[PDB]
Design brief:
This is part of a larger assembly, with four copies of chain A and four copies of chain E.
Chain A (H helix, E strand, L loop, with lengths): L2 H8 L16 H20 L14 H6 L4 E5 L1 E2 L12 E5 L4 E11 L3 E6 L2 H7 L11 E6 L7 E5 L6 E10 L9 H4 L21 H17 L2 H8 L4
Parallel strand pairs in A: 5-6
Antiparallel strand pairs in A: 1-8, 2-3, 3-7, 4-5, 4-8, 6-7
Chain E lengths: L1 E7 L4 E2 L6 E6 L2 E5 L11 E4 L2 E4 L18 E5 L7 E8 L5
Antiparallel strand pairs in E: 1-2, 1-6, 1-8, 3-4, 3-7, 5-6
Classes of the chains: A alpha+beta, E mainly beta.
Function (chains A, B, C, D): Forms the tail multi-ring barrel with ring protein 1, ring protein 2 and ring protein 3.
Protein name (chains A, B, C, D): Ring protein 4/5
Subcellular location (chains A, B, C, D): Virion
Amino acid sequence: MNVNEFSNEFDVLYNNIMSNAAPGLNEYEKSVLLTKAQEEIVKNYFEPAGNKYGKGLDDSPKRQIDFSELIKVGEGVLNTSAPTITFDKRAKVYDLPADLFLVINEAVDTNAGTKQIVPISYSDYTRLMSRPYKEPVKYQAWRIITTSINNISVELIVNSNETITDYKVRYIRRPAPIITTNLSSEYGDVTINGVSTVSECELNPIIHSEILQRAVELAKAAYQGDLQASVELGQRSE
Amino acid sequence: MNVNEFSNEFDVLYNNIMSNAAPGLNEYEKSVLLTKAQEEIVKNYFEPAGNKYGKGLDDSPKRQIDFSELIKVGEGVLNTSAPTITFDKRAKVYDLPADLFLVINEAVDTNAGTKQIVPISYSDYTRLMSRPYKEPVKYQAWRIITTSINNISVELIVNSNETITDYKVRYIRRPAPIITTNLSSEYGDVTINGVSTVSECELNPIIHSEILQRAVELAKAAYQGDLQASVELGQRSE
Amino acid sequence: MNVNEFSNEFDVLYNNIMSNAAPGLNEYEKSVLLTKAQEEIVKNYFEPAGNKYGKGLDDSPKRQIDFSELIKVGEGVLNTSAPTITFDKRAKVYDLPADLFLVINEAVDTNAGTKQIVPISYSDYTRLMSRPYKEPVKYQAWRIITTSINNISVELIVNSNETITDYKVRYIRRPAPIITTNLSSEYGDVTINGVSTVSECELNPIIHSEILQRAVELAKAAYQGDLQASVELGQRSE
Amino acid sequence: MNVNEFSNEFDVLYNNIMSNAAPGLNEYEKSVLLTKAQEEIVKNYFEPAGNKYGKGLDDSPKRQIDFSELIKVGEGVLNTSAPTITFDKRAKVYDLPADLFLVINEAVDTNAGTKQIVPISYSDYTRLMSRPYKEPVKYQAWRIITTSINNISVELIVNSNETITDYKVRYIRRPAPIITTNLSSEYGDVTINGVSTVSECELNPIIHSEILQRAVELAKAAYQGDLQASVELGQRSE
Amino acid sequence: VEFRADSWDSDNLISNKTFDTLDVWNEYQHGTTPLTNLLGHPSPLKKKFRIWRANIPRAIANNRDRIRNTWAYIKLGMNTPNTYRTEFHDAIIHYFA
Amino acid sequence: VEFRADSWDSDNLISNKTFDTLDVWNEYQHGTTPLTNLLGHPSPLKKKF
Amino acid sequence: ALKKEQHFFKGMQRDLSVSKFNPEYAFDAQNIRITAREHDTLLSVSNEKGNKEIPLQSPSGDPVVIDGVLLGQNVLNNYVTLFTKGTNDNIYRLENKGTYFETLILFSGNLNFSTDYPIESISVYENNNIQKVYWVDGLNQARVIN
Amino acid sequence: ALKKEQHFFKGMQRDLSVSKFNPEYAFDAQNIRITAREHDTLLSVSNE
């Protein structure tokens, strides 16, 4: 659905079947609600417990087609420019892509061979560093996040006696805003996420209906003005 | 039922006014609701838990006839034009059909033979690639989505020492919109899914009644405008 | 019951015992509601979980007499006219009858002998095509639906080294509309399913009472105009 | 009770007016309700779960006397006139009686001997025909309904190497309508089931009271006109 | 239009003839039916238990749309020759808001 | 502002033109729209039933 | 359905906006009567009883045809006095008997009479013989007739 | 939304505080007529 279809069809649902019976939303407000709705839909359909089916990213064909146009593969760049301090002796700091939303697969190409990266929690790190050897298994590497400035920095703790030659990251790209008009034309300097012009949906058309319905629900709740409605539909913001 | 009928029994079951002196419920709004109803019906009937019976795509004769008019078999075309970066060393990037809704069977024809494709989750990729061999079973190949631009691109991780000759995809085609009348006649530049002319329903007549009833329910719940009704009938949007 | 009896007896039930106490339905509206009611009754009495007894097509003598006048036996015609692409190497595309509602028995007559067709789901196809042999059992054949244009097309995957000479399909015929008057006489160009003239019920008289009662319930719900009534009686539309 | 009585105690138990100055509840409407009540009673008492006791056709002496006046034994006539197509190679098409409601016993007399007929479901046909022999047990024959035109036609799948001489059917006859008065006298061209004259009840007197009470309940619930009452008393239409 | 009414003919009640037309209209609609009463078949006018009830006409333009408006003019009348005294007590109008 | 109103032209109803402006203001606010009615697109003024 | 409304008819009202009309009144009515007349039908709409012709027989019994357009009438006590124009300018005296009007032609001549100037009359009863009817046009002299 | 209010026009009123104005009157009107003239539009605003 083009942006013009998202605006026209919001009023067949929010505005009492385009009857001007409900309050009436500007195009900036519709754009804001659509952007928030798409963020909510992505977050809910990612986590299995966030949706109504109990199914996550790759738990059904529908979910696979939902995130199909967000999945991106990018390389990490060595953060040798800044001589920071790492928590681990053998940690090579790598910076991740800027348009990163959620990581789902990471791999590192060493001289010994490719090794799947395990994002290791702060408890497992303390548990595994209390042992004699203190290295990953032969076919894996660890990863912990470190001091990050306006980006995402990750320490790659690969086994000693090995050098990192590559670092591939497969992640969900940050969705672009949904904007139904040139906001600068009538609204002075309002931006949704830094873009003031018409922005289409960068998602598969399968979830456009989901996003529009969530936007309509959010609009109706924000206008009913009840605290109860706001807190109830705020549950699904995550 | 054809478009004129869809409009006519929608009028009968909703009690709208065909006259234009009283605007009534017009054809653009009815077309929008019928569309939304048909995507809702497709989504709810594909997922077994989305309906009341607990039966999915091929869980009963009725469901097999429901999606029958949507099943399409098409080949994937190699994406060698763009020299992108893959997450696997042995991944050949293939582009999927544009009018794709849900993939239900995939197969790849190699020199070794035809091998059924297993859409492997992001967790299973790390799990099976943390082992010695790191190749599929003899008669299967893997598939993970990759960087996609206005389409869906899939990495085909087939066993090394083998080449891919064909890649067949049996998928559910994206339903075409239900448009009761040429929108450009009265409605200047409105669209439903990029179409403006008369769009007959591309589905089996068996689910035409389901689509009409769902559209009528959506019409009533939207015209009511209650937040509670909107949230309850939004649960059936997936 | 002739159509005249369906119209006259609708008013002994809908119209407060023919008292003109309730709203009053035209003959076109009564025809539409009767057609919808018969579709609903067929769908509910087919699926065991759709009715109140938990009994399907052949689960009791009453159900056997209900669908007795819909069951039809027809042959499939080879779709050699269109050189389409099949998902399976040894699939012979066959077109099914146009007036098809639900399939209940299929058989194929090969040179080796008759073989009962098993409608195989998309999961079982991937499961059975991951094995060494990849052929049906000696007394069965598989069937999956393929690219269909304004009809029903089925791939018959019979064992290799065998040729298909026949393909018999036993199915439930699509019911004809119920129309109580010549619609063109007073209503301009309204059709129920493409027929504008008097159309009798093509079903056994046993379920005529069921169809009339369902039509009366549908009329009362559509006129009470409550969203709750519409969504409640919309449950039984499937 | 005869027709005059049915009308008279209907008047007593419903409190209608026999006078025509006040129209009251007239004879056509009472006849329609009594008919509908008698088919409802037959359907509810045949199915054990349809009544309150949980007892079907032959589950108690009362039920045996209830259907006693409806039990009819008649032969099936060969349908060799029309050269239709059968779903089985060894199926002889036979036509059933026109006034048929429910079949409770069937038997076929062959050269080998009399063999009881088993109405075999659509699933069991595939199940038993996917085996080596594909013939019934020694003392039984199968039966599946086939293409029927304004009647019921049944395929008799008896064991090969045998011929069918007779086909007896013991079935519940279709009840004749309950018509209190000659409808053509005042009501121009109305009918109930194609009959217009006085139709005495063809059932045992034991269920005449049940029919009258059910008709009175239907009359009250229809005159009330409430949707809720219509749905609740529609549940007892099967 | 539920309404009580009675037509007489020299001290003789006439339970079959009360009114002969019902014109209902508004700013954009106009319908009319003759108010016939056929005992067996459905008709615009039906009597039962001494109350008359007439289905309001539908628009002439479409012949399908009901009279839907915030208000409407309701007109009962006799236009067939006859000589009866027709007492017309009151009339209830059933609508759906 | 829900309101009933009707414009005529020599016994002919006109279901498209009722009003052409709506000025709403208070001590610290003032807004105005032309009250156009576009059937397909949203507009300040819409009629239904 | 959902709702109802009862309509009584206390009268006939017009001139009020349709949005604000009162259900107790009727907007327009033809040949009805809301007051109880010849029957106890008060506050209930009822018909108008028709007219019945009364023959105009002369005292000899022959029919009396009236000449032409009527300009005015006058009922003194039981004598109706008609001033009609036509081929001549006539005056009549009609007395209501049981079933007929005993018509007499008091004059038939050229009393200048015009349809543009109808008649207005006063009639007095002084005694059995002096029963006068004074009448005036807007055009001619005032006149008297016994 | 939450609440409504209906406004009829029995006349034109001024001079009253905006906080205490009466919904039955109009604050200011140009070229209108509230009495039924040439049509039955009494107590309904109509043109001149």
